[model samples]
Target: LVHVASVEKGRSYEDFQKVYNAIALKLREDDEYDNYIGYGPVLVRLAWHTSGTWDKHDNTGGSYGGTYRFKKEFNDPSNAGLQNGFKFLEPIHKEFPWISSGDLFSLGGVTAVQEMQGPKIPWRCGRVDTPEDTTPDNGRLPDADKDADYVRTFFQRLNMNDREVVALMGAHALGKTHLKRSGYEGPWGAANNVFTNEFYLNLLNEDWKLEKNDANNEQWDSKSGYMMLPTDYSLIQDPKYLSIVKEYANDQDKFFKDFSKAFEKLLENGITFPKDAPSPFIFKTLEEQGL
Candidate 1:
């Protein structure tokens, strides 16, 4: 199951930039969603969930197939609140019907990250839509209730190393876990829409206590109105992961650089880009364009 990259017919960087602008504008206008936290966090979450299905062992699920559009994948309990992000993109997809689901999903994340003051993620576009049969079954996603070892092992399936895993988990700096959705509730940091190394900072600095939510699930709660999943707490619990967390907490620039690389790799997994394919596209944020 080696998926190869193929740029869409008559498509280029400018075309995707236009799509990026559309998403960015909508993000600015739709500021009321999620209690005014905006659509940025959920969009990042959608992109991650959509691409996180990649299994390096067999490439069964990844952003390459755009299978999340199918009912089965869409209905997965793991994807429980992502429908908001999907619906936000519906009009954009309707206007630009040429973009594949995978590209749109991943691009939404890139756009959100940059517009929300995060790093510039170099993204490649070549995902073509596939049939429902191609959708990987549920449970391919990691369990939030797991431990440090489970976090390390789960990401191994995606070929992510310790540094990459810790960097990617920094995404928790952006979105809260819904009690009904994942049995965990609360944001990991104060700025849930801005992507930062706050996840690591909080993990290292917060006076978190083990407690059970109404769902009877164990999670680390802090008096500062923040929470961390067992998996997130693992970053500080494990000696190796703790070292990386400390490094990221101390250096914002390093976290940004590492996260940008790891995130691009996460999105590009399960796809085979040709030797001469064009370089990844670095999109300009709306701020850069004076928008």
Candidate 2:
């Protein structure tokens, strides 16, 4: 384990969970964005993008800085549609002004992932705000049009193994691709809001037609009215990736177990957590809390 700095004096696990509740309740209400698709998916994307900035070697980028709140990071073209997630968190920030931007953004990722039925990502809070200059340059995120090698190489920078990489992409199960956002459109499963192994199930079961979307971009489609990006569909095409896909599709518990570990690592990518730091927190979902 890396050496994590101590939490700021005033906040505790429960306090941060309250911030968790704020994000949770709002997610239920903000069901109008992205063609009324809701905040769940993009919020997960926001957390992924924020943490994806890490460069393992120097530990410079990643979620520790919380710099995405600045205009510079917020406006990056790669982050084009993520503003919806940021705006979704604004009221939470207004309500809990004490949480660091890093903590808040990363926590939103944790909340969205767990609430979507993905995994119980363990979280620790200690991120502090940094200047806009701390924002990583554009083009760091994985391109939607890339192939397996591109996806593999892109994830290596963050130290994700092939299995981990595949599980993380499983998140696409929760949201649709907007033609205006990732130059693709349509959801990957019947329940776009709830996280499940449906992405893997859909990948294996759907009779995908290699068709171009309305945007003229290539994606796999099915009569079920769902779509998968070429990169997403490639998982099943590759034997090794297909193996993991089958494992996840057959076992929800395994998917949750692996996904929770991988997603937490993704959220904590660049930071160093100390030896004495507390264990990961499993936050209560709105459904769990009867909220």
Candidate 3:
């Protein structure tokens, strides 16, 4: 078991902060996507999709190696829409050529979560690039059309529990499901660019009606014009998940805490961190640091 601390050796904290600045500046420049929702949510989703492929039992897939830069992983059907996020990061990656693809992608996620009023997700460095052959097979990511059972079963391979699964799905609140991208359409909550407990609140509080979108796919629609994927809506349908939903909805701090832990785990899955390594770094936001 390679402890989380063992994997070290990358640009220093000061340098990583520079990479953060590059990403934050680019986020400011790129404000046009999904009807001006910006690149934050989709970037977070990209990090999730990239890291979600891990199978904890064998450790075949995970963020330890930046494999998504390869054609095979990038071409995966489940990753259909994430190309935009990659393209958006391409220039920044070029500017900071020292950072690994794995680090850049994961850091993008951490930055987005923090910049959007979400919890602070501690991050580390030291993911090396792997060969194309190391790319895990496709069909590893969760399907948005499924139910709670499917969601649970899929996450189990990644060693995620019911609460963890529910917490991670709250990220859908950040980005909308595009009809052209995922064959699903509509935002999951009112604040698509900002991360909040709104996903849980919307799921439990809204009066949802099942309806077919323009693409002829069915989704749960609320009067607020927000839509939830059947998989997303299944959180409330299942009693185990409903408890978590209600808890997060009523308590924003709890939601942030849970989400921070869950997302950090998701991003760090598969890679073993040694105990001797430096403590996880909690970066100050651009506003907090006056950057």
Q: Among these predicted structures, which one has the highest TM-score?
A: 1
Task: Give the alpha carbon lDDT tens digit for every residue of 1-291 in model 3.
Answer: 231333335457888888887888788777887678888997898889889899877778788777888888899988988989899899988998888889889999998888887899999887777778888998888787888889888888989999898888888888787788778888888898888888988888889999998889899998889999999888988999999889989999988888899999998888766656566888888888776
Measured on C-alpha atoms, candidate 3 has an lDDT of 0.85
TM-score of each: 0.98, 0.94, 0.95
Error of 3 at 161 (Å): 0.7
The C-alpha stretches of model 2 lying farther than 4 A from their native spots are: 1-4
Stretches of candidate 1 exceeding 4 Å from the true structure: none
Top-scoring candidate (lDDT): 1
Q: Summing lDDT over every window of 10 consecutive residues in candidate 3, give the lowest-scoring window.
A: 1-10
* CA-lDDT, candidates in order: 0.92, 0.83, 0.85
lDDT of 3 at 70: 87
Better of 1 and 2 by lDDT: 1
RMSD (CA, Å), each prediction:
0.8, 1.9, 1.8
Regions of candidate 3 where Cα sits further than 4 Å from its true position? 1-10
